[PDB]
Scaffold this active site. Structure first.
Site, PDB file in Angstrom:
ATOM      1  N   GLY A   1       1.015  -1.192  -0.025  1.00  0.00           N
ATOM      2  CA  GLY A   1      -0.126  -0.229   0.235  1.00  0.00           C
ATOM      3  C   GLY A   1       0.902   1.123   0.064  1.00  0.00           C
ATOM      4  O   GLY A   1       1.441   1.498  -0.437  1.00  0.00           O
ATOM      5  N   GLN A   2       0.182   2.297   0.921  1.00  0.00           N
ATOM      6  CA  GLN A   2       1.007   4.181   0.381  1.00  0.00           C
ATOM      7  C   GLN A   2       0.229   4.206   2.245  1.00  0.00           C
ATOM      8  O   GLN A   2      -0.104   4.461   2.213  1.00  0.00           O
ATOM      9  CB  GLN A   2       0.715   4.652  -0.741  1.00  0.00           C
ATOM     10  N   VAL A   3       2.033   4.992   2.829  1.00  0.00           N
ATOM     11  CA  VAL A   3       1.500   5.175   4.067  1.00  0.00           C
ATOM     12  C   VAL A   3       2.012   6.629   3.844  1.00  0.00           C
ATOM     13  O   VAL A   3       3.446   6.875   3.427  1.00  0.00           O
ATOM     14  CB  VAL A   3       2.595   4.185   4.884  1.00  0.00           C
ATOM     15  N   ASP A 117      11.252 -11.525  11.469  1.00  0.00           N
ATOM     16  CA  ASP A 117      11.889 -10.921  11.443  1.00  0.00           C
ATOM     17  C   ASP A 117      12.350  -9.295  12.515  1.00  0.00           C
ATOM     18  O   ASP A 117      11.817  -8.430  11.811  1.00  0.00           O
ATOM     19  CB  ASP A 117      11.761  -9.927  10.458  1.00  0.00           C
ATOM     20  N   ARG A 121      15.581  -2.420  12.203  1.00  0.00           N
ATOM     21  CA  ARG A 121      14.995  -1.826  11.360  1.00  0.00           C
ATOM     22  C   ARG A 121      12.771  -1.677  11.845  1.00  0.00           C
ATOM     23  O   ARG A 121      12.435  -1.274  11.618  1.00  0.00           O
ATOM     24  CB  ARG A 121      15.072  -2.276   9.725  1.00  0.00           C
ATOM     25  N   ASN A 122      12.956  -2.649  12.090  1.00  0.00           N
ATOM     26  CA  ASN A 122      11.652  -3.459  12.558  1.00  0.00           C
ATOM     27  C   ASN A 122      11.299  -2.284  13.926  1.00  0.00           C
ATOM     28  O   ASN A 122       9.874  -2.964  13.913  1.00  0.00           O
ATOM     29  CB  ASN A 122      11.025  -4.523  12.564  1.00  0.00           C
ATOM     30  N   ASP A 135       6.258  -4.446  12.425  1.00  0.00           N
ATOM     31  CA  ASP A 135       6.656  -5.091  11.167  1.00  0.00           C
ATOM     32  C   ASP A 135       6.457  -4.601   9.682  1.00  0.00           C
ATOM     33  O   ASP A 135       5.582  -4.544   9.741  1.00  0.00           O
ATOM     34  CB  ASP A 135       6.227  -6.423  12.013  1.00  0.00           C
TER      35      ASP A 135
HETATM   36  C1  LIG Z   1       1.285   2.133   8.407  1.00  0.00           C
HETATM   37  C2  LIG Z   1       1.370   1.020   9.676  1.00  0.00           C
HETATM   38  C3  LIG Z   1       0.764  -0.110   9.389  1.00  0.00           C
HETATM   39  C4  LIG Z   1       1.266  -1.324  10.644  1.00  0.00           C
HETATM   40  C5  LIG Z   1       2.486  -1.630  10.589  1.00  0.00           C
HETATM   41  C6  LIG Z   1       3.137  -2.651  11.066  1.00  0.00           C
HETATM   42  O1  LIG Z   1       3.825  -2.130  11.953  1.00  0.00           O
HETATM   43  N1  LIG Z   1       2.309  -3.733  11.419  1.00  0.00           N
HETATM   44  C7  LIG Z   1       2.208  -5.182  11.783  1.00  0.00           C
HETATM   45  C8  LIG Z   1       2.424  -6.552  11.163  1.00  0.00           C
HETATM   46  C9  LIG Z   1       2.587  -7.589  11.641  1.00  0.00           C
HETATM   47  C10 LIG Z   1       2.211  -8.679  10.437  1.00  0.00           C
HETATM   48  C11 LIG Z   1       2.301  -8.704   9.789  1.00  0.00           C
HETATM   49  C12 LIG Z   1       4.393  -9.695   9.702  1.00  0.00           C
HETATM   50  N2  LIG Z   1       4.677  -9.596   7.583  1.00  0.00           N
HETATM   51  C13 LIG Z   1       4.888  -8.432   7.470  1.00  0.00           C
HETATM   52  C14 LIG Z   1       3.096 -10.943   7.364  1.00  0.00           C
HETATM   53  C15 LIG Z   1       2.895  -8.145  13.123  1.00  0.00           C
HETATM   54  C16 LIG Z   1       3.621  -6.222  13.539  1.00  0.00           C
HETATM   55  C17 LIG Z   1       3.622  -6.510  15.029  1.00  0.00           C
HETATM   56  F1  LIG Z   1       3.243  -7.283  15.861  1.00  0.00           F
HETATM   57  F2  LIG Z   1       5.648  -6.639  14.867  1.00  0.00           F
HETATM   58  F3  LIG Z   1       4.406  -5.106  15.751  1.00  0.00           F
HETATM   59  C18 LIG Z   1       3.238  -5.454  13.352  1.00  0.00           C
HETATM   60  C19 LIG Z   1       3.735   0.272  10.384  1.00  0.00           C
HETATM   61  C20 LIG Z   1       3.449   1.036   9.720  1.00  0.00           C
HETATM   62  N3  LIG Z   1       3.669   1.865   9.612  1.00  0.00           N
HETATM   63  C21 LIG Z   1       4.610   2.696   8.927  1.00  0.00           C
HETATM   64  N4  LIG Z   1       4.685   1.623   8.381  1.00  0.00           N
HETATM   65  C22 LIG Z   1       5.661   2.174   7.022  1.00  0.00           C
HETATM   66  C23 LIG Z   1       6.534   3.125   6.919  1.00  0.00           C
HETATM   67  C24 LIG Z   1       6.605   3.780   8.101  1.00  0.00           C
HETATM   68  C25 LIG Z   1       5.603   3.120   9.314  1.00  0.00           C
HETATM   69  C26 LIG Z   1       4.986   4.357  10.185  1.00  0.00           C
HETATM   70  C27 LIG Z   1       6.127   5.609  10.458  1.00  0.00           C
HETATM   71  C28 LIG Z   1       6.292   5.919  11.752  1.00  0.00           C
HETATM   72  N5  LIG Z   1       4.913   6.008  12.383  1.00  0.00           N
HETATM   73  C29 LIG Z   1       4.315   5.535  13.196  1.00  0.00           C
HETATM   74  N6  LIG Z   1       5.021   3.789  11.444  1.00  0.00           N
END
Ligand SMILES: Cc1ccc(C(=O)Nc2cc(CCCN(C)C)cc(C(F)(F)F)c2)cc1Nc1ncccc1-c1ccncn1
Length: 259
Positions: A1-3, A117, A121-122, A135
């Protein structure tokens, strides 16, 4: 997607996704995040909607870039030299990031969550400099330098392999965002790791912190510490007067390599 940064906490990052893989992954991801609950050291699901997946914003970005920006000798030598410091981050702040991640992973692993993972970076550096497990995703190349041997060889992923990756994350923290096994190829890792090769002790690192790292990388998954054990050791260290990560400048000071 797009953040994109948005406001609805109020400040948010929102993943924008049009309604086959992406559809499964977005649903899957939402499913996971709903089951995670809330804790200061994990990301904060604000909500999802259809007209979009939003989490609380982290103004300081991901931990890898944060560690690297603290390398003040490269970033601002005049400040660094005048102050005899290699980092705007203290040993205390570094071990606190590490403790935050251990605290968050203890919380998640007690729910039988397996991250798969873990790497700087995460990790997001969030409000009040509280580290938050996230993640962002993976050509989808395997994160070989963070992976336990049993994950590389059998795709076995457990809390114990998460602990391996955590040990490498700990190495990233202490080295201020250095590339693990710099100057070594991933193919050399497939070879050398089963031979018992591990990352060497960073120069700026107390033996005690290196030893915690080494425990995380035991060949036998069952011999690795738990996240709660890691947390308690880190907490112990943080309580002491002793400095564990040396961030002072000296004549022959060099950073762990990145590129
Ligand atoms: C919008 C969004 C949505 C979901 C997530 C995210 O961490 N999702 C996620 C997703 C999963 C399950 C998916 C695992 N594999 C990818 C399959 C686990 C976690 C856990 F448990 F480790 F926290 C987290 C991050 C973000 N944030 C984000 N993403 C990309 C660029 C920047 C951000 C961001 C920047 C600043 N502040 C917050 N988010």
């Amino acid at each position: 997607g797009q953040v994109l940064k948005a406001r609805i906490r109020m400040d948010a990052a929102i993943k924008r996704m049009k309604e086959k893989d992406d559809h499964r992954d977005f649903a899957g991801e939402l499913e996971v995040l709903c089951k995670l609950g809330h804790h200061p050291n994990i990301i904060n699901l604000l909500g999802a909607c259809e007209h979009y997946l939003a989490i609380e914003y982290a103004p300081h970005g991901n931990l890898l870039d944060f560690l690297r920006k603290s390398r003040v000798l490269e970033t601002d030598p005049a400040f660094a030299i005048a102050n005899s410091t290699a980092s705007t981050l203290s040993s205390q702040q570094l071990l606190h990031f590490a403790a935050d991640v251990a605290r968050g992973m203890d919380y998640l692993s007690q729910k039988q969550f397996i991250h798969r993972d873990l790497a700087a970076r995460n990790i997001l550096v969030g409000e009040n400099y509280v580290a938050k497990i996230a993640d962002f995703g993976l050509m989808g190349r395997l994160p070989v330098r963070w992976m336990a041997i049993e994950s590389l060889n059998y795709s076995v992923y457990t809390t114990n392999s998460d602990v391996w990756s955590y040990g490498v994350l700990l190495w990233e923290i202490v080295s201020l965002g250095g590339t693990p096994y710099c100057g070594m190829t991933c193919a050399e890792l497939y070879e050398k790791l089963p031979q018992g090769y591990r990352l060497e002790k960073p120069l700026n690192c107390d033996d005690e912190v290196y030893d915690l790292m080494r425990q995380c990388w035991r060949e036998k998954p069952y011999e690795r510490p738990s996240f709660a054990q890691i947390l308690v050791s880190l907490n112990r260290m943080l309580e002491e007067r002793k400095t564990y990560v040396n961030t002072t400048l000296y004549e022959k000071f060099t950073y762990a390599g990145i590129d």
